[PDB]
């Protein structure tokens, strides 16, 4: 189970200062007991009434949402207009979280839902967290909801899983006890930085291992860098994806891994969806080409892309 | 550890024959005769369909338990948890669909087929587009705490299921949000105290056939009126009922203007005059905003906002 | 329920079949930092790539497009044909049992007999965690995986069910014991899954006509369910010729209306190129001259 917020006479909750006040069953109208939802944001205050008691609340710069007694979920605009019909959840609410126009409800049954209330679509449809934690005695130490409506569970053992909605999977994006980052020898703001944590302030070049042949450290470094690219992808973190894609590409250039390099260049050139995490794949290519060019070994690859880019410019 | 007892939806009994009036406007009768012959060891059941004196028929390889039909489709549910869907003139449209549990009831509206199973799951398919609309949603959430019944069941012309419960509550399933949504509630209705100036929502509510409050200050009646009208607008959107959405949005905007709800009507106008869909519920939003600006202009406090909206709108000569 | 592969020190598996594509796994070979590494190696034609993983590989699978591995702690990783990790490791809800890959389609069947299919090229799920308790009381047999990512399960009772991703359903596309094929009288993956009729002495001709109708309509719908495009063309036009020859006018007109115009394509073919191909079979019957005429609508 999960702790269910107990009924109260009234309460206040904070969240860019803005807060929520709730007063339950303050008045009666046509036989219907009313509960009040007040939102104090900057200078302006809005309010509204609901026909059942408010158990918990959450809000963002765009959205206020409220979990009420009869397993009901209501969502209101930045200025207090009801956005959606009340949502019946299959289990009593445990916690609510909002990020932008994304609303996340975690129920007492340990299931997790995420809606995009601006677009009026589900993002994460009732994902059990048993399916993650399994027979292991772990604990979801934290839970974050990104600006894309992507949930991330930081577990007690150092592993972080985030749900990919298009793949409909939980995906490992950090494992502090099996990280390859200290081994990784190659030439902060976003989500991936925050989840992994060692992104506090540590961009130090790593040392060559005295313990293993060079090829082992090369493969550890490859694997680490491809993990970072992949992870920024599943997290849909556009800026982090660009950063790691460029670092990885530089490493491929400097170590001479031609097949992986040509492969990503082909994928970024197309002949296919022209975008990844909302970036133009060919603009990403065009950003990599100078790095490719600084190594004479790839002069033809650099040239091929460049020429195939110019032909693309001439519609 | 299983419950000693768990209610289920009932499964139609095997019958040798039955007929069923499945059509109204184009009146349509369906006849079923089960296990009437054998070919190659395979026992066959017959399905017959009568529409306006024209008659088609076909055979199935298992007993037909129940059936439904519209102007567009006829579908049958059979033992071994199979569902088959046939065109208006009798052609099988899709492979037999394996249901997760035995059928209980079938409904059709246009090309939408809805199956409610013994396990109390609900499915809706658009057989014209051949896409699932509602994927095996448990009815447990809606039924827990009820009196074990559902008074009425609608499948709207956009394939949305609506459950009207005896306690006055109606829940519809929204396919995009993927939620059960409360779109009506006669007991907790704010409608009787709301003071302001054929569709699905109209049917679900008892409303197709207000006083000043003495006990509370005027602001409370305004807030109940606002909550009610927002509920109506949201309910119409959830039902994807376009005429009713436009109607309630227009009443709601008139109210916001009358009582001077500045920030709410600002928000609504910004949304209607725009990552932005030009459409809601199959309507051109800017057209609706144009249908507002009369009402908004009718008030002095919103002169600036009417001017700005007719401005950026008239900038559509470009 | 289903069996889990047991840990090994090393193993090899031929995966693809276009060239000899071999895969070699060496579990926990070296330690970088405190991290034990397992090696993944892939040989295809003359080319060898490799990479490391941080947990032990339990089984592998692959195709001309991808190699994927299932590891301990219920993890699933996917790599390009150059050894590049394509996706973050995927947490399976239950330990793996088997893996299949067809092109860029990856299918996991876990020990809890739940089945999943991902399109790793487009990065979308095809089949999201489908239990086989429902589709299975008989036991299972061969599991196929088509080139559009459709799962197909042949069961021990002769029935095959394939999972349509759009309808999100299990659909019956073959049933040997109840097959209407032996008695039907008319003159890709569906062939593979399924495997002149005498006239019947024991039933009236109308029963064999309806059985033949239902069989052909089943074949059309099964090809359309399997997304097998050439089999759909074939069976549509065999069925259409049965309709023409036997005089079933309303089914025929209906097919023409649909193919005329509304979605403009079917199973990746132009719905009007099909009307073009079956206008002449309509034309060889005098009774349907008007229909062959009424379809002369061009533009």
Author numbering:
A (entry chain A): 682 to 696, 700 to 871, 882 to 965, 974 to 1017
B (entry chain B): 675 to 871, 883 to 894, 900 to 964, 973 to 1016
C (entry chain C): 682 to 817, 821 to 871, 884 to 891, 899 to 964, 974 to 1011
The study reports:
The presence of the Histone regulator A (HIRA) with the histone variant H3.3 in a soluble complex has implicated this histone chaperone in the specific deposition of this variant. HIRA is in a complex that contains at least two other subunits, Calcineurin-binding protein 1 (CABIN1) and Ubinuclein 1 (UBN1). Furthermore, HIRA serves as a scaffold protein to bring together the other subunits as well as ASF1a. It binds UBN1/2, CABIN1, and ASF1a through its N-terminal WD40 repeat, C-terminal C, and central B domains, respectively.
To determine the molecular basis for HIRA homooligomerization, we determined the crystal structure of the C-terminal half of HIRA (aa 644–1017) at 2.4 Å resolution. The asymmetric unit of the crystal contained a homotrimer of HIRA(644–1017). The observed average value for inter-subunit buried surface area of the homotrimer is ∼1440 Å2,consistent with its high stability. We confirmed the existence of three distinct domains as previously predicted and refined the domain boundaries, β-strand (residues 691–859), loop (residues 860–907), and α-helical (residues 908–1017). N-terminal residues 644–674 were not visible in the crystal structure, suggesting that this region of HIRA(644–1017) is highly flexible. The trimer is arranged in a ring of two layers, composed of β-strands and α-helices, respectively. The β-strand domain is composed of two β-sandwich motifs, β1 (residues 682–774) and β2 (residues 775–860) motifs. Trp799 and/or Asp800, which were identified as critical residues for homotrimer formation, are located in the β2 motif. While Asp800 does not interact with an adjacent subunit, Trp799 is located at the interface of the two subunits and forms a hydrophobic patch with Ile771 and Val806. This hydrophobic patch interacts with Leu851 and Thr853 of an adjacent subunit.
